[PDB]
Ligand binder design. Structure first.
Ligand SMILES: *C(=C)C1=C(C)[C@@H](Cc2[nH]c(/C=C3N=C(/C=C4\NC(=O)[C@H](C)[C@H]4[C@@H](*)C)C(C)=C\3CCC(=O)O)c(CCC(=O)O)c2C)NC1=O
Ligand SMILES: *CC[C@H]1/C(=C/c2[nH]c(/C=C3N=C(/C=C4\NC(=O)C(CC)=C4C)C(C)=C\3CCC(=O)O)c(CCC(=O)O)c2C)NC(=O)[C@@H]1C
Ligand SMILES: *[C@@H](C)[C@H]1/C(=C/C2=NC(=C\c3[nH]c(C[C@H]4NC(=O)C(C=C)=C4C)c(C)c3CCC(=O)O)/C(CCC(=O)O)=C2C)NC(=O)[C@@H]1C
Ligand SMILES: *[C@@H](C)[C@H]1/C(=C/C2=NC(=C\c3[nH]c(C[C@H]4NC(=O)C(C=C)=C4C)c(C)c3CCC(=O)O)/C(CCC(=O)O)=C2C)NC(=O)[C@@H]1C
Ligand SMILES: *[C@@H](C)[C@H]1/C(=C/C2=NC(=C\c3[nH]c(C[C@H]4NC(=O)C(C=C)=C4C)c(C)c3CCC(=O)O)/C(CCC(=O)O)=C2C)NC(=O)[C@@H]1C
Ligand SMILES: *[C@@H](C)[C@H]1/C(=C/C2=NC(=C\c3[nH]c(C[C@H]4NC(=O)C(C=C)=C4C)c(C)c3CCC(=O)O)/C(CCC(=O)O)=C2C)NC(=O)[C@@H]1C
Ligand SMILES: *[C@H](C)[C@H]1/C(=C/C2=NC(=C\c3[nH]c(C[C@H]4NC(=O)C(C=C)=C4C)c(C)c3CCC(=O)O)/C(CCC(=O)O)=C2C)NC(=O)[C@@H]1C
Ligand SMILES: *[C@H](C)[C@H]1/C(=C/C2=NC(=C\c3[nH]c(C[C@H]4NC(=O)C(C=C)=C4C)c(C)c3CCC(=O)O)/C(CCC(=O)O)=C2C)NC(=O)[C@@H]1C
Ligand SMILES: *[C@H](C)[C@H]1/C(=C/C2=NC(=C\c3[nH]c(C[C@H]4NC(=O)C(C=C)=C4C)c(C)c3CCC(=O)O)/C(CCC(=O)O)=C2C)NC(=O)[C@@H]1C
Ligand SMILES: *[C@H](C)[C@H]1/C(=C/C2=NC(=C\c3[nH]c(C[C@H]4NC(=O)C(C=C)=C4C)c(C)c3CCC(=O)O)/C(CCC(=O)O)=C2C)NC(=O)[C@@H]1C
Ligand SMILES: *[C@H](C)[C@H]1/C(=C/C2=NC(=C\c3[nH]c(C[C@H]4NC(=O)C(C=C)=C4C)c(C)c3CCC(=O)O)/C(CCC(=O)O)=C2C)NC(=O)[C@@H]1C
Ligand SMILES: *[C@H](C)[C@H]1/C(=C/c2[nH]c(/C=C3N=C(/C=C4\NC(=O)C(CC)=C4C)C(C)=C\3CCC(=O)O)c(CCC(=O)O)c2C)NC(=O)[C@@H]1C
Ligand SMILES: *[C@H](C)[C@H]1/C(=C/c2[nH]c(/C=C3N=C(/C=C4\NC(=O)C(CC)=C4C)C(C)=C\3CCC(=O)O)c(CCC(=O)O)c2C)NC(=O)[C@@H]1C
Ligand SMILES: C=CC1=C(C)[C@@H](Cc2[nH]c(/C=C3N=C(/C=C4\NC(=O)[C@H](C)[C@H]4CC)C(C)=C\3CCC(=O)O)c(CCC(=O)O)c2C)NC1=O
Lengths: 18, 172, 177, 162, 113, 172, 162, 146, 177
């Protein structure tokens, strides 16, 4: 029911600076 | 219809248990956020027409067979039903955001939307592209301040994107 | 049957795009956590027979009418099938945790399970009540907070794999509702 | 379930609209009130065994025929005394659910829907339960708005029995 | 094919409980002996009686009598009938409710009070 | 619905026959009972609340898991619906007793009752115990005199017991 | 009003047809039963104050707290005892009305409809009246089919109170 | 009015109540000790605990009828069948009147303060009207069984 | 070992912080309700010999195979060792209620207790039952709701001490399971 990549790419984008 | 507070009361009553002190403290963390959850919902519903219209215009520019004559969104009847189906999903995500639990989302929007579109011939692959376009139009709109006290809301905008991911895998 | 890599290609095939850019950077961080997912599938398969016999016994201690004369788990022929019905559900969830996508769970196990159970006369209230016990066991084994056995892992956090395995076990209960 | 959160969602779904500020203000009032509601739920849970066994004795002192009279409806035997204290604990448990949730939604669903037909069938008097609920209102020892929150669900149960 | 004492028990459950009194629980029959066990917990009839709740403050002293008048008698003078190797003891502990009889009682002797 | 007099008429219309002389003499015996049938329906209806409640009282003494949290009769709505069903079955068994034919009993109560309890999870082996406890409370109420003239009613109490056994096998 | 004659006119007016021998046989059954129903109405009317005074005294012996407990809902004063004997007369009078018209019609309209709203409001126990109706059932002195007609409407009043 | 002598007469019973029924039914065993013989019916643990419960309940009825001041609290159903309950169970009823007549003689001892073990402080005056009232109430229980 | 004031200063030592007025309002209410903490622990040690023998013999009552041949409370040798052990458990949870922190119960009593019991043969499900009786005996002496033995206190709530000591009794079951 979850998307692991689409949710594993948003959590690593807000914690890690650009 | 359960919110996040009623999700743990219903799970306690199936065993006849009082709620423990470690469960009241987990619920008061939701009251502690509180004002930041109400601004996620306020930012989404106050831009709801721009979120749906810009995501539809971008959807037909990528799959132009949907608005060809004979396509699934030709003939204004079918075009206007495609636009309110996008606004239906955005409505129930904002319902599930203010509750803290995805109970109203997958009981009375998503429960049987894969086999609704399958019986109609609607391409559920193309519906999921439209949820993903409304998803990042909303999370780009959630984490900007523009008259908002600056803080960290990234655990709430990861919850909002998970509701959009829940609707996306459910229609295809 | 899709895995987590097949889902981002099906989504890119609908618009006829090459995979690259931002969704290639979301895929490189999915494999950075690929050892935590492999560490955590092993922590469930290793305890798979105690997880089932505790969830079926815990469904029975809550509702002892299932082992009364006339109950659904009454005879030895029916007790052995509930212990089999309950470890197929755990087996298909471990496929979805290894794949990272609940497609194989939803169509090879969950599509039509509710209509099957209410045609054999199986109480779907109790099946939900055993699936929710297996949910509490799987989050305890992944976060290494079992009271009965502590495993060995490298130090770190795996609270996103516990949020994912709870979403798979909540679906199983919502599907056979 | 009737909560302040799910009465706002059900208001917007019956009109087919997004959550406007009419519904964000109703949710905000629950968050402003949930401080006193969640400490009342902690203090009634920690006083559970004291309040249940004390309120069963308050009924046996006002209605002392209920311990002498034979029959299955009275607390005259080992399982009638066990079923009387079980019912005070059902009432105390639903008050703590209503304080957590924020409305009279758990005890509307789990307790009061069908309660008049049960009391008339099994010959239970609703003036027994009013006396035990007046004991819990006068023995939890809470003060201020924490007592105002706990008392508002105790005499919601009194108005459905009286 | 019902037997005459088979119901004479069952007519007292037809009256309402305000006028049938104790006899309102006459419809429960004899369970098997494992049905009163700690998974199942079938309730005996005597609970629905006041004889379960005979818990008085008063007490006989038993030392004010003459010596030789207080009589006591054990159930069996055996270690192996009072308690077996398993816990299925008819006399010691909480397993005295697991008898195949003693589920129902004779409370159609008295009155409809 | 159709009673026992209408039952043999419908069996005779489908053959296109007048009723026999033997068949009229068998319907004279059904009128000859007549008052004894109306005594059983009077005794069962007059004690209808006490038969349902005291046989629910005896069910929860022998199966006390039904009223534990997580049991099928634990809440007020779920207990009041259980007494309501036991009064529904006793209603249509008295309807089948005054008619002499179990046709209103299954066409308006029993057909679809097994399908209902399998979609809800209601234990069907415990419903049949409640049916069998209203049976022997009523067949013991049938053959007591209590203001009836003395006679033999043992053929009409085998018919009343057969309507309770019919309602019990349509749910177990 | 539910009488056997109005329930036969209603089943013929519902389909808009004249009365037939389906309906004439129903009114005929009232007339054959009204021989025993009108002697029980004479007998309960003549024995009224013997049965109202005696049935009030049987509630005070079964539930002797009702004459001891203070409060407006109890027969522990001169006024509360006057309202208790007034209530036994209301129940006995509706039984004689039902024997006259041949159905459970007058006590539906005048006694049963709205009864449990009153017993909840004014805190009256419905088992106070079951013991009163059980005294009248055991001490009216009728026999034969005259008793079976009187007991069938007394037992109807017990079924609505439980 | 003078109900202070009434409230002293109730409190002389209800303070020393659990000794009184302990001294009532043990004196009933003391006059015929066949009830605690095996085969007797105060022999078992449940039957001995029930016999203390009934003497407490009879003393609850007398001390409540003394406090109200009339025998209308003794007009309860318990009166009927106490003979017929004790016949149907099988209970020595003339032994049960011996259990009540000890409690009749104890209640006039506590009211008049002529108890030869315990001596309590009261005011000066008379209380023999109330001691005849409890002798009236105990014989009504003593007529309910026979 | 630590107490409730030492537990705060090892939390601040991970941050090298000062225990200031934000952190001190938990410790200013530990001394404010500190009379009731002393008032509750002599409600337990005044009844401690009655509490042990009722909990051990109440475990024999629900399980009579503990005193048959082959039970592990069989002879006088084994029954006195079970009575000694339940007094040790009740001693260490009275230290932990007095300190206000379950450190001394967890390292001295409970650390390594599971391995003693699976080497000596002690049944752990019935041993949890003897601890769970005297948890219910302890919350009834603190809130003064026991059927015999009303002690003389002052008026107010001790409802947070009764659930603090119920969590200390729950750590004994979690450590031998
Ligand atoms: C032998 C086994 C035996 C008896 C027989 C029976 C003797 C007995 N004693 C009395 C009299 C009293 N009992 C009283 C009750 C108590 N005494 C107390 O002071 C405490 C409070 C309480 C319980 C111990 C009292 C007050 C009296 C009157 C004594 C006095 O005059 O001061 C009777 C009743 C009188 C009679 O009818 O004989 C009997 C039968 N007890 C035995 O042990
Ligand atoms: C003691 C009885 C056992 C029991 C009963 C139980 N039944 C229900 C719910 C329903 N039963 C019906 C069946 C009928 N309804 C009718 O009107 C008629 C007349 C033609 C019949 C035959 C229906 C429709 C329902 C559902 C609606 C409702 O009444 O709420 C329930 C409630 C189940 C629930 O989930 O709410 C119970 C508990 N269950 C037991 O445990 C007993 C063995
Ligand atoms: C993350 C989502 C945001 C962000 C949010 C914050 N908002 C904070 C406080 C705050 N918000 C509101 C408005 C809110 N309350 C309502 O009742 C309604 C609608 C009816 C809305 C939209 C108010 C009134 C307040 C003040 C509450 C208070 O402080 O007393 C907030 C707290 C500030 C802090 O502690 O840092 C945060 C973080 N902030 C962000 O940067 C993103 C964009
Ligand atoms: C198997 C021996 C594993 C193991 C599994 C775990 N079970 C965990 C929790 C748990 N178990 C039950 C069922 C149990 N409780 C009962 O009341 C009854 C009988 C009536 C039984 C059989 C329940 C109800 C729960 C809790 C569910 C919840 O929390 O709501 C669990 C969690 C943590 C822990 O116990 O450490 C695990 C890991 N435990 C083991 O040690 C072995 C390896
Ligand atoms: C010593 C007698 C103390 C005392 C202690 C208390 N014990 C309390 C509860 C309790 N005791 C038992 C064991 C008892 N029940 C049995 O079935 C058997 C024999 C097989 C025995 C010996 C149990 C099971 C329980 C209840 C525990 C539970 O519910 O799980 C207790 C609780 C308060 C109460 O009883 O209401 C206390 C205080 N009681 C005393 O007064 C003296 C000082
Ligand atoms: C809850 C467990 C009780 C209850 C408790 C209260 N106790 C209160 C005050 C209190 N207790 C003691 C004795 C205690 N303090 C000591 O220093 C020592 C031994 C050295 C002991 C045993 C004292 C001295 C006090 C203070 C009052 C006084 O001096 O008389 C109390 C008042 C609140 C407070 O001041 O902390 C409460 C509520 N009362 C109850 O109703 C439950 C059952
Ligand atoms: C145990 C937790 C349940 C329960 C289970 C029973 N299941 C029974 C039969 C059965 N189960 C299935 C579904 C199972 N097979 C699969 O392939 C998959 C997933 C892909 C699942 C979940 C089927 C198809 C059947 C019937 C065919 C067969 O058994 O081979 C069963 C026996 C019923 C019977 O013997 O008639 C039981 C007892 N029942 C319970 O009460 C608890 C809640
Ligand atoms: C059988 C289960 C009973 C029993 C029944 C008998 N009843 C007899 C006669 C009878 N019954 C009634 C009452 C009935 N008729 C009605 O019209 C109405 C209500 C509208 C009712 C309730 C009447 C009026 C009569 C008189 C007719 C007559 O006497 O023939 C009867 C006949 C007596 C005989 O022939 O021996 C029997 C056997 N009697 C029993 O002992 C069992 C318990
Ligand atoms: C009779 C069995 C006694 C006895 C009784 C007398 N008592 C007299 C006065 C009196 N009595 C009490 C206690 C009583 N009054 C109450 O209000 C309550 C409880 C609420 C009780 C238990 C009081 C307080 C008084 C007033 C004087 C005082 O302070 O003690 C009394 C004098 C008559 C009068 O003035 O009321 C009598 C005769 N005296 C006896 O000799 C026997 C043994
Ligand atoms: C004791 C001094 C007697 C004695 C007493 C026994 N009574 C037994 C049962 C019993 N007793 C009563 C009467 C009591 N209950 C009331 O509600 C009232 C007042 C309203 C009174 C006076 C009843 C109704 C019952 C039956 C109900 C029940 O068992 O709970 C009894 C047990 C009998 C048995 O089953 O073996 C005993 C032993 N018997 C004696 O030997 C002395 C003389
Ligand atoms: C009783 C509730 C149990 C039970 C107890 C038995 N324990 C036996 C030996 C034993 N127990 C302990 C632990 C205890 N001692 C400590 O010093 C501390 C912590 C400070 C604790 C908790 C030890 C260390 C030992 C062995 C040392 C010794 O006794 O010499 C025992 C004897 C076994 C035997 O005779 O072979 C028993 C029976 N057993 C039960 O069945 C109930 C559940
Ligand atoms: C105790 C203060 C008084 C008392 C209690 C008593 N109650 C019953 C029986 C029932 N009580 C309920 C009530 C509920 N059940 C629920 O599930 C809920 C919501 C969670 C409520 C409020 C019900 C349904 C019953 C009947 C079920 C049963 O049989 O157990 C009894 C037993 C009555 C009987 O006939 O069995 C008793 C004794 N009675 C007293 O005397 C006290 C004054
Ligand atoms: C006597 C058996 C017991 C008893 C009686 C009692 N009843 C009341 C009050 C009312 N009774 C009724 C009932 C009816 N009114 C009707 O019109 C009819 C149909 C004809 C019925 C059945 C009503 C409506 C009331 C309240 C209004 C009124 O008083 O008129 C009281 C007084 C209670 C009060 O005033 O609040 C009493 C004392 N109570 C007992 O203790 C007896 C056991
Ligand atoms: C084919 C067999 C096979 C396996 C079984 C796994 C085994 C495995 N797990 C991890 C490695 C790890 N595993 C965990 C997992 C956890 N740590 C916790 O504290 C939680 C309790 C738990 C689940 C969240 C963490 C946090 C790491 C550290 C590396 C990382 O973050 O990915 C590593 C890499 C580190 C190392 O080399 O030691 C390996 C090889 N991989 C395999 O190839």
């Amino acid at each position: 029911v979850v998307l692991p990549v689409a949710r594993a790419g948003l959590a690593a984008t807000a914690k890690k600076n650009q | 219809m359960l919110d996040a507070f009623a999700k743990v009361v219903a799970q306690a009553d199936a065993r006849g248990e009082f709620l423990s002190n470690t469960q009241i403290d987990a619920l008061s963390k939701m009251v502690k956020e509180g004002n930041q959850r109400l601004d996620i919902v306020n930012k989404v519903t106050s831009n709801a027409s721009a979120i749906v219209t810009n995501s539809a215009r971008a959807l037909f520019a990528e799959q132009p067979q949907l608005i060809q004559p004979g396509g699934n969104a030709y003939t204004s009847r079918r075009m206007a039903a495609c636009l309110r189906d996008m606004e239906i999903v955005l409505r129930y995500v904002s319902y599930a955001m203010i509750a803290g639990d995805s109970s109203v989302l997958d009981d009375r929007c998503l429960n049987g939307l894969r086999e609704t579109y399958q019986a109609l011939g609607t391409p559920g692959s193309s519906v999921a592209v439209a949820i993903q376009k409304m998803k990042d139009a909303s999370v780009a709109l959630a984490n900007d301040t523009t008259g908002t006290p600056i803080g960290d809301c990234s655990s709430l905008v990861a919850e909002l994107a998970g509701y959009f991911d829940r609707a996306a895998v459910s229609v295809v | 049957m899709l895995d987590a890599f097949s889902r981002v290609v099906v989504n890119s095939d609908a618009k006829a795009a090459y995979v690259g850019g931002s969704d290639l950077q979301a895929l490189k961080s999915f494999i950075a956590d690929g050892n935590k997912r492999l560490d955590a599938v092993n922590s469930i398969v290793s305890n798979a027979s105690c997880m089932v016999s505790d969830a079926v016994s815990g469904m029975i201690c809550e509702n002892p009418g299932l082992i009364s004369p006339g109950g659904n788990c009454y005879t030895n022929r029916r007790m052995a099938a509930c212990l089999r019905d309950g470890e197929i559900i755990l087996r298909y969830v471990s496929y979805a945790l290894l794949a990272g996508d609940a497609s194989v769970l939803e169509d090879r196990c969950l599509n039509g399970l509710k209509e099957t159970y209410i045609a054999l006369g199986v109480p779907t209230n109790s099946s939900i009540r055993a699936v929710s016990i297996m949910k509490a066991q799987a989050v305890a084994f992944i976060t290494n907070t079992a009271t009965e056995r502590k495993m060995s892992f490298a130090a770190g956090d795996c609270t996103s794999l516990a949020s994912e395995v709870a979403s798979y076990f909540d679906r199983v209960g919502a599907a056979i509702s | 379930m009737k909560t302040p959160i799910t009465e706002a969602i059900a208001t917007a779904d019956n009109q087919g609209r997004f959550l406007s500020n009419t519904e964000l203000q109703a949710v905000n009032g629950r968050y402003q009130r949930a401080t006193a509601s969640l400490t009342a739920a902690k203090a009634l849970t920690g006083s559970a065994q004291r309040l249940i066994t004390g309120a069963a004795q308050a009924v046996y002192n006002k209605f002392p025929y209920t311990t002498q009279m034979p029959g299955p409806a009275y607390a005259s035997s080992a399982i009638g005394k066990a079923k009387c204290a079980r019912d005070i604990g059902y009432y105390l448990r639903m008050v703590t659910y209503c304080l957590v949730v924020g409305g009279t939604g758990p005890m509307d669903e789990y307790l009061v829907a069908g309660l008049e037909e049960i009391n008339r069938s099994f010959d239970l008097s609703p003036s027994w339960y009013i006396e035990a609920l007046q004991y819990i209102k006068n023995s939890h020892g809470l003060s201020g708005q924490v007592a105002n929150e706990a008392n508002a669900y105790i005499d919601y149960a009194i108005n459905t029995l009286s | 094919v019902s037997t005459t004492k088979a119901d004479l028990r069952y007519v007292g459950a037809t009256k309402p409980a305000a006028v049938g009194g104790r006899r309102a629980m006459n419809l429960m029959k004899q369970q098997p002996f494992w049905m009163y066990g700690p998974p199942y917990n079938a309730v005996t009839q005597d609970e629905y009686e006041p004889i379960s709740a005979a818990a008085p403050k008063a007490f006989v002293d038993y030392q004010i009598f003459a010596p030789g008048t207080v009589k006591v008698s054990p159930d069996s003078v055996n270690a192996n009938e009072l308690n077996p190797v398993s816990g299925m003891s008819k006399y010691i502990g909480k397993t005295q409710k697991l008898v195949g009889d003693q589920g129902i009682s004779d409370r159609s002797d008295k009155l409809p009070m």
